[PDB]
Design a binder for these strands. Structure first.
Lengths: 108, 335, 228, 335
DNA sequence: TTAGCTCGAATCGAGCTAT
DNA sequence: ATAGCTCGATTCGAGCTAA
């Protein structure tokens, strides 16, 4: 919960940057997560990316952060074989569905 | 005391090349030297949602709203030219020999015992059954994985090369030789003798393998599929890319080698499925299961350990499987 | 002021000072023999204790890096499956019968290295006990990595007596063993003055070189070598 | 008492360059100066569970679950073109001279004694046996490490480049000259005398070595492999990285030097392995063991200490080993 | 605990011997 | 390997100072 709270805070403090930093040129700029990283691009782009962000409602960012957390957890096969990984996956699913519900209503 | 080594790396025999795809017309196979190559092409696809939902996405309003925005993708596709019904797939195969000698080992006593075991096998039962099965998988176009599943006629030609010229040529009908039975044929016997001479170290064996499959005018062929780093947008997702070397659709060499290794008809489960690729723990990706589990003591590692350390020679079929595993190579030997 | 000696280390001040802010300062540089480790500009109002506390952290991280770099290699006793570790022994050297090994079920106990490419042999509990007795590493075996091989050899024709700096690795309060010079002299059955004559600086006329038996018995009694 | 020096650094003779890999067809190798380079490219590999399991991963459910999640990764792969069967590998070799002189020496008396010892060696028998064995490893394509194991015809061309021009040309059949025996041949003798003049310091010699290997059309070639930091995603893992300098597959210069260094046939163990690289403690990476153990009193350091410090000259074979190790160079002496 | 220092006495190495 | 010697240099113990 503290990791997901800090992720939400980090996006909130990126919200104070320039509105159109996501439109800068670059080969790797994380376009999948740039919809969530810069909400303010929809103001300048009335028809380029505002409707895409409204209709798509990107919640795969939660899946990518869950994959990052899976990369950040210890690779213990004893937990994976036992139900400890089951409880860890259940609590991770609860925290990520809460986090996805947070990112769901960002268009209001 | 003869404990097994911590590193037992083996180099692969039966080295296959990348198999290139070109296309043309049937009865022009004798003049198929300058056939145009099959080129990987870009096309745009749009589809509706068809995956299973997890009982929470089954809301009709949400499903209809998802259909209002169908996914847009671009994919790589390989097709024949419209004036061409035959697929030509050509690769080369080197048969090396020296299967039982590891490329890396720790224990010299284990290496000597394993080489003695392999020499005992070769003396008692040479590379004959294995070579017959390899020649069978080479004479039926199993390396044409999805390219012969619905072909009207599949015809493969095997040539033997010494000085850049054909030393002996083989002509086969790949639909007559099925994907199931390892029968006996005089041309197949000669090809098996050549593979045996290659695997025994008697001489150099280089074979070019050209397979012709009459599929249809402008039909879709199926080359090897690569991976995508997925660093683009959601419109041009590039969800599918195909393998090519120089603007020519190709099949990965390891896929051809996997199709050539499909000789294992000795796994404990019922052989109604047919042959499977020779590999430790008999793990086929299609069914996602492992024939020759270590629990039933018929995997490669337990058989090799019993044959070499305890001198418990398995059945001739199981030692054929073990020597085929030595032929395919590997990084056998844990810490 | 004057140079501060902490075991093998030395904090010597600069001959000329400077003024940082409005206060006088000198640069104090830390050595490990001839190797300069760090320099700090310190106020002239610091005592020796504060100057030593300024470099205590660098000395501590040197000690940690020396313990991790020269740690003795570990042998592991495992069962037939080779997965469960039954006993761990740190050895000064490996058995000469170690070869590339994966445990079988032919023997119940196997002795294996902790290194990732594992070396080993089948071993009984009596043989494992004998090997652990005659190969074990003393608790301060990492200090031997900081000493040359010509002072740690048992060959008397290839042996060289340690210098004062090599003695101060193990003999002082600022050394790696932490025992005093009087305690080291008590361990050898020697007078404290005679043992101070061993660790006497170069600015001295009475200097004695330690003998083969005395040096090796000191290493035994300090827990550095030949103590299992 | 003339103890040994603490600093005994040596510089290497027989300096090779990086060996570049190009491709083409046999019987046009006389016009191979414009052959296209072999390019390192990417392909995708899909693998199953083929390594040993530690008695806890051998459960059928866990093994099948590991099958359902295969390891996807990309590998750097170098292949010949489908119309080219010959691999060309070219490097330049420079032989310096002055082997017994260290680059750094603490003791002047030990320096003088070592110089007298090496001068006594050269006066007794010069760099003739060592240069003959180096010329043998030049004549056979041992620097063509895995590209020689299955090549049908291997030919090595060695030129002497005096003023940027071929002052003397050698052409060899690298398969007639095996990897086991150091025989005598007139052209081998001439190249041996040239390398001897290089090692003695009589003149400057620069050798351009070009090797052609007839492997097959589209067959895999094997350049040197690099290190992977192992930080990216598991799907795009880059499990194998190949060495290239400018979009051209290359072999490391130290690998070429190690293959030329394989002249040591005098180690105490038997001649089953054949020659090994002249290294202190006779280390072979593939076998994971050390011939010439220090316990057996036949390593470089004990022989050098007996020869120089206390005038115990070993056998002429061990003298050849010691001088070849001085040619090899290294940071000798107590650190 | 560090860092030394005389002062006579015992020890140390490397020469020789004898049996 | 035993058994023992001489002779000059080095070590050794127990006083002492010096901090």
């Amino acid at each position: 919960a503290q990791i997901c709270d800090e992720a939400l805070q980090y996006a909130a403090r990126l919200r104070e940057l320039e509105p159109g930093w996501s439109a800068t040129p670059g080969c790797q700029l994380h376009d999948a997560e740039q919809l969530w990283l810069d909400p303010l691009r929809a103001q300048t782009d009335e028809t380029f990316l505002q409707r895409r962000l409204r209709g798509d409602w990107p919640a795969e960012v939660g899946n990518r952060f869950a994959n990052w957390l899976n990369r950040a957890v210890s690779s213990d096969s004893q937990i994976l074989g036992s139900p400890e990984a089951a409880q860890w996956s259940q609590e991770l699913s609860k925290e990520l569905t809460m986090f996805k519900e947070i990112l769901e209503d960002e268009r209001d | 005391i003869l404990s097994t080594a911590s590193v037992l790396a083996f180099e692969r025999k039966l080295d296959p090349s990348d198999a290139l795809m070109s296309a043309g017309a049937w009865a022009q196979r004798d003049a198929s030297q300058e056939w145009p190559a099959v080129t990987v092409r870009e096309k745009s696809v749009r589809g509706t949602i068809s995956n299973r939902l997890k009982t929470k996405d089954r809301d009709p309003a949400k499903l209809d709203a998802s259909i209002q925005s169908p996914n847009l993708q671009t994919v790589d596709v390989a097709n024949l030219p419209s004036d061409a019904d035959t697929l030509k797939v050509r690769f080369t195969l080197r048969v090396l020999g020296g299967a039982g000698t590891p490329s890396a080992c720790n224990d010299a006593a284990y290496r000597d015992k394993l080489l003695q075991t392999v020499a005992t096998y070769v003396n008692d039962q040479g590379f004959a059954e294995l070579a017959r099965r390899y020649a069978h998988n080479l004479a039926n176009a199993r390396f044409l994985w999805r390219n012969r599943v619905g072909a009207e006629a599949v015809e493969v030609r095997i040539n033997h090369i010494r000085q850049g010229e054909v030393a002996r040529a083989w002509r086969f009908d790949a639909l007559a030789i099925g994907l199931r039975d390892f029968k006996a044929d005089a041309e197949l016997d000669a090809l098996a003798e050549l593979i045996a001479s290659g695997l025994s170290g008697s001489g150099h064996v280089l074979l070019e393998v050209v397979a012709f499959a009459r599929i249809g005018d402008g039909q879709e062929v199926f080359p090897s599929q690569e991976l995508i780093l997925d660093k683009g947008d959601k419109k041009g997702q590039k969800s599918k890319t195909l393998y090519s070397v120089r603007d020519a659709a190709a099949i990965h060499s390891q896929k051809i080698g996997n199709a050539l290794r499909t000789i294992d008809t000795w796994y404990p489960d019922e052989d109604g499925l047919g042959p499977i690729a020779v590999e430790p723990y008999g793990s086929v990706t299609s069914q996602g299961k492992a024939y020759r589990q270590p629990k039933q003591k018929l995997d490669f590692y337990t058989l090799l350990d019993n044959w070499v350390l305890r001198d418990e020679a398995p059945a001739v079929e199981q030692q054929h499987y073990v020597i085929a595993n030595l032929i395919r190579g590997g990084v056998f030997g844990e810490a | 002021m004057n140079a501060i000696h902490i075991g093998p280390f030395s904090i010597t001040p600069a001959a000329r000072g400077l003024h940082y802010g409005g206060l006088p300062h000198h640069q104090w540089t830390l050595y490990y023999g001839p190797r300069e480790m760090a320099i700090k500009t310190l106020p002239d109002s610091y005592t020796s204790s504060e100057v030593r506390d300024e470099f205590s952290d660098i000395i501590a991280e040197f000690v940690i890096d020396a313990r991790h770099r020269y740690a003795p290699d570990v042998l592991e006793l495992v069962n037939s499956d080779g997965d469960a570790v039954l006993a761990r022994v740190a050895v000064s050297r490996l058995p000469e019968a170690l070869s590339g090994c994966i445990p079988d079920d032919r023997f119940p106990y196997w002795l294996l290295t902790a290194s990732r490419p594992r070396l080993g042999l089948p071993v009984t509990l009596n043989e494992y006990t004998a090997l652990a007795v005659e190969l074990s590493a003393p608790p301060l075996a990492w200090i031997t990595g900081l000493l040359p091989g010509e002072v740690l050899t048992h060959d008397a024709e290839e042996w060289r007596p340690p210098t004062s700096w090599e003695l101060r690795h193990v003999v002082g309060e600022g050394s790696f063993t932490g025992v005093s010079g009087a305690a080291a002299a008590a361990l050898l059955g020697m007078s404290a003055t005679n043992f101070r004559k061993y660790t006497a600086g170069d600015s001295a006329a009475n200097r004695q070189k330690i003998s083969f038996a005395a040096w090796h018995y000191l290493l035994d009694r300090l827990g550095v070598k030949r103590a299992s």
